[PDB]
Design a protein around this ligand. Structure first.
Ligand SMILES: CN[C@@H]1CCc2c(ccc(O)c2O)[C@H]1O
Length: 281
C-alpha cells in the first residue's frame, strides 16, 4: 500500500536530476555565446550531478525497496566508491566556484591574468584527482573495513550491502569533503558581502536625490541545510554507537542527494541561459 507509491516519487527525483543536468550541458555545448572560463566549473558540476543521477540513486532505490541486494559484493563496493566520488567532487566544485567569485570581485584589474583557459583545466583535473584518491583507493583496497562481529557478518554475506566504516576513515573523509570547503565558502562570501555593502554605501554617498542579502542567503542556506545534517551524524554515530539509528542515517543521506537537483536553478538563471533554453525548445 506504501511500496507502490514511493516508487513514483523516487522516479520523479531521478527524472528531474537527469533532465536538469542534461539541459544545462546541452545548452553550454551547443551555443557559442555561453562558453566562458567561468562556465567550465558549471560544466564539471553538471557532469558530476549527471553521473550521480544515473549511477547512485537508481541502485539505492532498488536496494531500499527490495530490502535485498540482488547483485554481488563487487558491485556494492563499486557503487559505494562512485557515490563517495560524486559527492566529494560536487562539493569541491562548489568551493572552486566560490573562490572564483571571490577573486573576480576582490581584484578586478588582474582577474584576467590569474585565470585563463589553460589553468581551468589544471584546476578541474586536480579537483577530480583529489576526489578520486579519497574514494577509490581506500575503499577498493579494503582499508576502511570495520572490526566488530556485526561488520564481519555483513561483509561475509553476499546479500546485504550496508555501510560499515572505521573511525579514522569516517573522520578523514568528513574533513576532506565538507568542513574545509564550508569554511572557505563562509570566508569568501563574508568578504564579498562586505565589499558589496561598501560599494552600495559609496553610491548613495554621491547620488543624494538588501538586494545581495537574498542572493547570498539562497546559495548559502540551500547547501548548508541540504548537506550539514548528514555530516553531523556521520561522526556522531561513529563516536557513539547507541545514539544514531540506521534509518535516520539513510534518510539524512537521501536528503543530501537531492541537493544535486537544485543546482541548475541556483547557478543557471542568467538571461543568456534563459535565451539558450528558449532556443532549444
Ligand atoms: C553510504 N553512503 C556514503 C557513506 C559515507 C560517505 C558518503 C559521502 C561522502 C563521504 O565522504 C562519506 O564518507 C555517503 O554518501
Amino acid at each position: 500500500v506504501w511500496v507502490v507509491g514511493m516508487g513514483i516519487v523516487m522516479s520523479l527525483i531521478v527524472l528531474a536530476i537527469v533532465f536538469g543536468n542534461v539541459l544545462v550541458i546541452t545548452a553550454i555545448a551547443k551555443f557559442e555565446r555561453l562558453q566562458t572560463v567561468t562556465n567550465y566549473f558549471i560544466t564539471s558540476l553538471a557532469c558530476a550531478d549527471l553521473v550521480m543521477g544515473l549511477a547512485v540513486v537508481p541502485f539505492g532505490a532498488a536496494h531500499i525497496l527490495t530490502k535485498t541486494w540482488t547483485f554481488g559484493n563487487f558491485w556494492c563496493e563499486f557503487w559505494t566508491s562512485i557515490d563517495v566520488l560524486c559527492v566529494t567532487a560536487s562539493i569541491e566544485t562548489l568551493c572552486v566556484i566560490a573562490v572564483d567569485r571571490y577573486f573576480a570581485i576582490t581584484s578586478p584589474f588582474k582577474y584576467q591574468s590569474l585565470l585563463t583557459k589553460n589553468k581551468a583545466r589544471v584546476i578541474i583535473l586536480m579537483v577530480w584527482i583529489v576526489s578520486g584518491l579519497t574514494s577509490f583507493l581506500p575503499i577498493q583496497m579494503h582499508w576502511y573495513r570495520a572490526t566488530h562481529q556485526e561488520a564481519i557478518n555483513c561483509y561475509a554475506e553476499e546479500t546485504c550491502c550496508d555501510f560499515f566504516t572505521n573511525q579514522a576513515y569516517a573522520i578523514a573523509s568528513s574533513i576532506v569533503s565538507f568542513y574545509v570547503p564550508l569554511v572557505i565558502m563562509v570566508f569568501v562570501y563574508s568578504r564579498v558581502f562586505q565589499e558589496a555593502k561598501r560599494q552600495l554605501q559609496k553610491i548613495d554617498k554621491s547620488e543624494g536625490r538588501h538586494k545581495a542579502l537574498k542572493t547570498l542567503g539562497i546559495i548559502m542556506g540551500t547547501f548548508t541545510l541540504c548537506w550539514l545534517p548528514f555530516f553531523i551524524v556521520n561522526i556522531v554515530h561513529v563516536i557513539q554507537d547507541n545514539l544514531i539509528r540506521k534509518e535516520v542515517y539513510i534518510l539524512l543521506n537521501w536528503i543530501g542527494y537531492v541537493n544535486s537537483g537544485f543546482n541548475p536553478l541556483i547557478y543557471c538563471r542568467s538571461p543568456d541561459f534563459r535565451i539558450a533554453f528558449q532556443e532549444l525548445l
